[PDB]
Design a protein around this ligand. Structure first.
Ligand SMILES: C[N+]1(Cc2ccc(C(=O)NCCO)cc2)CCCCC1
Lengths: 213, 208
């Protein structure tokens, strides 16, 4: 099998910058290599074939080069919508092989989250469970601490988090923290609060609500 | 321009045949290959068939596991995976190409190997510049798709990767932000589809 070792593994850079991904073949593969870009929630899309040639509709700010065992993809005016994972591909000798990939995040100014809290539906409660959701919206960077509290006692072990890939337009992230309790547990307490700590905030902001009002 | 057979939940040791067909042309008069995406996101060339010389080309790693055939008559390509194990759980794409012209991948087929049974999600309203959403809880297997107002609403929509909760059931919420003024003027319906369990539900999200 021909190995394609690609680097860097991960890279963060500002809009308008120039960066380059690289691939190392383990055997001169001529110029039989392609470059692929895969945006969040989509199949990969070929950018380049034959190391330096572009496919229609692929912006000129993409260029490929190199040969033998040394290949490079360069992006020259990094745009937000550029946020993706990039892969090189060798197709000079079967079996075709892909590089491990390069995840390109974009550096943007800090931006504080917008915090919203959601009580469980009166319809979900009926069935036995209670999920209290806390949404942190459009922030940067991706690092954020969320603390759940109920009647002012801090919680652990009954929450889960999820974060979206960087938004292609505003380069922000969004996160959700979900508190899962049993119906009984939920009706035991009154005050339900979600506290958010983020470097874009001078001091942690709290969004809470009282049960039944 | 490519369609692929729906998502799949296949019991270990059992098998699965994935289909792939084009809408306005025959994929069978172009080269066709399949690619597997697994542990996180990472690609493996399975094998391919050339339209001008009998015989599918296979990668050894999948010799014995993958069988590739076509049916030039119906313009359909097939991939048969036998003896499935949890390491066959992945997104499988069929791709088409011709010389240096195009090279286009299909949407993807999620494939989960597991003895569990399919379970559609419960969809709960996440009641309300303001945010609203839908909790899509307790479904199996992945994936599920959510959309707002039948597709009409796309700005500010944020759908979160699903989390595998301890019960072995998947869970995620979709959110959207809108103008608060709009809360007494516009109806907001989230539409959830979970192909595997033939579960399709519309949920009105309104101010509680
Ligand atoms: C698709 N590709 C590379 C490539 C991809 C898949 C195969 C392949 O699997 N061929 C089997 C015989 O038809 C061969 C080559 C074509 C040439 C440009 C770069 C992209």
């Amino acid at each position: 099998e021909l190995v394609m070792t690609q680097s860097p593994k991960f890279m963060s850079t500002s809009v308008g910058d120039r960066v380059s991904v690289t691939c190392k073949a383990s055997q001169n593969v001529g110029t039989h290599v392609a470059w692929y870009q895969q945006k969040p929630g989509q199949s990969p899309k070929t950018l380049i074939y034959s190391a330096s040639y572009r496919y229609s509709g692929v912006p000129d700010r993409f260029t490929g080069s190199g040969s033998g065992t040394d290949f490079t993809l360069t992006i020259r005016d990094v745009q937000s919508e550029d946020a993706a994972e990039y892969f090189c591909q060798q197709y000079n000798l079967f079996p075709v092989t892909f590089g491990g990939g390069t995840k390109l995040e974009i550096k943007r100014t800090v931006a504080a989250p917008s915090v919203f809290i959601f009580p469980p539906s009166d319809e979900q409660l009926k069935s036995g469970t209670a999920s209290v959701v806390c949404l942190l919206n459009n922030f940067y960077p991706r690092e954020a601490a969320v603390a759940w509290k109920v009647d002012n006692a801090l919680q652990s072990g009954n929450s889960q988090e999820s974060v979206t890939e960087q938004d292609s337009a505003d380069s922000t992230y969004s996160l959700s923290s979900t508190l899962t309790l049993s119906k009984a547990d939920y009706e035991k307490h009154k005050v339900y609060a979600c506290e958010v700590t983020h470097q874009g905030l001078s001091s942690p902001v709290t969004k809470s609500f009282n049960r039944g009002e | 321009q490519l369609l692929e057979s729906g998502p799949e939940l296949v019991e270990p040791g059992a098998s699965v045949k994935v289909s792939c067909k084009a809408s306005a042309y025959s994929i069978t008069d172009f080269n066709i290959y399949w690619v597997k995406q697994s542990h996180g996101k990472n690609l493996e060339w399975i094998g391919g068939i050339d339209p001008h010389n009998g015989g599918p080309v296979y990668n050894q790693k999948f010799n014995g596991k993958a069988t590739l055939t076509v049916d030039k008559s119906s313009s359909t390509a097939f991939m048969h995976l036998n003896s499935l194990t949890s390491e066959d759980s992945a997104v499988y794409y069929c791709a088409i190409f011709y010389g240096n012209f195009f090279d286009y991948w299909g949407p993807g087929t999620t494939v989960t190997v597991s003895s569990a049974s399919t379970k559609g999600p419960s969809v709960f309203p996440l009641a309300p510049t303001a945010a609203l959403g839908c909790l899509v809880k307790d479904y199996f297997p992945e994936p599920v798709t959510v959309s707002w107002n039948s597709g009409a609403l796309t700005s500010g929509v944020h759908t979160f990767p699903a989390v595998l909760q301890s019960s072995g059931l998947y869970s995620l919420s979709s959110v959207v932000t809108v103008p608060s003024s709009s809360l007494g003027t516009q109806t907001y319906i989230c539409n959830v589809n979970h192909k595997p369990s033939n579960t399709k539900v519309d949920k009105k999200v309104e101010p509680k």
